[PDB]
Design a protein around this ligand. Structure first.
Ligand SMILES: OC[C@H]1O[C@H](O[C@H]2[C@H](O)[C@@H](O)[C@@H](O[C@H]3[C@H](O)[C@@H](O)[C@@H](O)O[C@@H]3CO)O[C@@H]2CO)[C@H](O)[C@@H](O)[C@@H]1O
Length: 370
């Protein structure tokens, strides 16, 4: 029971929803159908709930990791573009949105986390995680901190856990093995232990969330933060003189971020599939439609080769790609939501001291593997 003749879009509150709304605004100025863009809370958990009932949005935007679960549950329409359109996008990006060899979403942008630093407070960013505790001791003396980032969402902590060997699911033939999980190996335990230690040594606080880390850096009280492209618009308005670069190394290895592909899916239950398709392929996925969204909140490296060509010149995009290169594309299997929930509890229990690192990762491994 969705109302034909309109488009309702769901996008996360951290993305350029006002720019998206302008893209729909000239969709309608030229097609008569109104597009309404919403950013509900926890949309990613709500979608499967109402979509199930034959409700929800026409189009849902999220990183590709949640899409194999939606596809398995029968909530998404298979998209079928065409080889000329497919050719306009980087091939690895359509691979991120293939579920059982079928395409189930349009790729939009490639996101990777980077190290953001205040050049006025730290002209040369550190190359290693290991020098962060000494750096904090000097800034603290001057009333500032070396680094603050969201500790509440496992997405932010995974690059460090993965650096020395942690992994989610082993990719074995061209299949992910759901029984071979790397959350409790020596690599994962070494990274999580370094994090807990920064905490126990008062270099970071266990409660820092997205808001606190973002205000701390935007106000100049912390020299560095770890975030994605979407955060740049707020740093620009704060006028901090910042740099975006490669994440620090841990035990000599590159921090390895999970790479996300912002994707747009069509609810299986919509009577507007062709309008949806119109909208995504001919309006949004254009240099003009992507530019409009990007002005609002930067998208990262886009999937459309044409526009990415324009963006690649920006050192912030170059740093984005370099960290994506060092990282791994997330799986899109249904089990990714179980993985994230288990790791989220493990990290909060370890950081808060409610469990040791070993008991926290062992419980997570257990939980993910049944
Ligand atoms: O931790 C519980 C949380 O896990 C799952 O969320 C993950 C997202 O699915 C995954 O894409 C990633 O999300 C980041 C987005 O990709 C990024 O664009 C930006 O919005 O930040 C997000 C992190 O806040 O990582 C999270 C895990 O942290 C699951 O889908 C959620 O329902 C669940 O609440």
């Amino acid at each position: 029971k969705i109302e034909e003749g309109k488009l309702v879009i769901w996008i996360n509150g951290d993305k350029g929803y006002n720019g998206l709304a302008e893209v729909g605004k000239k969709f309608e100025k030229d097609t008569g159908i109104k597009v309404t863009v919403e950013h509900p809370d926890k949309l990613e958990e709500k979608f499967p709930q109402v979509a199930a009932t034959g409700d929800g949005p026409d189009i849902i935007f999220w990183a590709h990791d949640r899409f194999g679960g939606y596809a398995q549950s029968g909530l998404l329409a298979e998209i079928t573009p065409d080889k000329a359109f497919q050719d306009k996008l980087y091939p690895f990006t359509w691979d991120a949105v293939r579920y059982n060899g079928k395409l189930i979403a349009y790729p939009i942008a490639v996101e990777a986390l980077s190290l953001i630093y205040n050049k006025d407070l730290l002209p040369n960013p550190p190359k290693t995680w290991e020098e962060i505790p000494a750096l904090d001791k000097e800034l603290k003396a001057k009333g500032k901190s070396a680094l603050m980032f969201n500790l509440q969402e496992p997405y932010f902590t995974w690059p460090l856990i993965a650096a020395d060997g942690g992994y989610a699911f082993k990719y074995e033939n061209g299949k992910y093995d759901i029984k071979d999980v790397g959350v409790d190996n020596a690599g994962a335990k070494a990274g999580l232990t370094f994090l807990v230690d920064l905490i126990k040594n008062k270099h970071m606080n266990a409660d820092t969330d997205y808001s606190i880390a973002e205000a701390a850096f935007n106000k100049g009280e912390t020299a560095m933060t770890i975030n994605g492209p979407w955060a740049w618009s707020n740093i620009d308005t704060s006028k901090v003189n910042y740099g975006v670069t490669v994440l620090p190394t841990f035990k000599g290895q590159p921090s390895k971020p999970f790479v996300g592909v912002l994707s747009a899916g069509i609810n299986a239950a919509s009577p507007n599939k062709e309008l949806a398709k119109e909208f995504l392929e001919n309006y949004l996925l254009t240099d003009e439609g992507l530019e409009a969204v990007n002005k609002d909140k930067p998208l990262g490296a886009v999937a459309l080769k044409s526009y990415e060509e324009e963006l690649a010149k920006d050192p912030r995009i170059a740093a984005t790609m370099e960290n994506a290169q060092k990282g791994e594309i997330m799986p899109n299997i249904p089990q990714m939501s179980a993985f994230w929930y288990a790791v989220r509890t493990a990290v909060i229990n370890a950081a808060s001291g409610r469990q040791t690192v070993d008991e926290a990762l062992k419980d997570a491994q257990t939980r993910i593997t049944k």
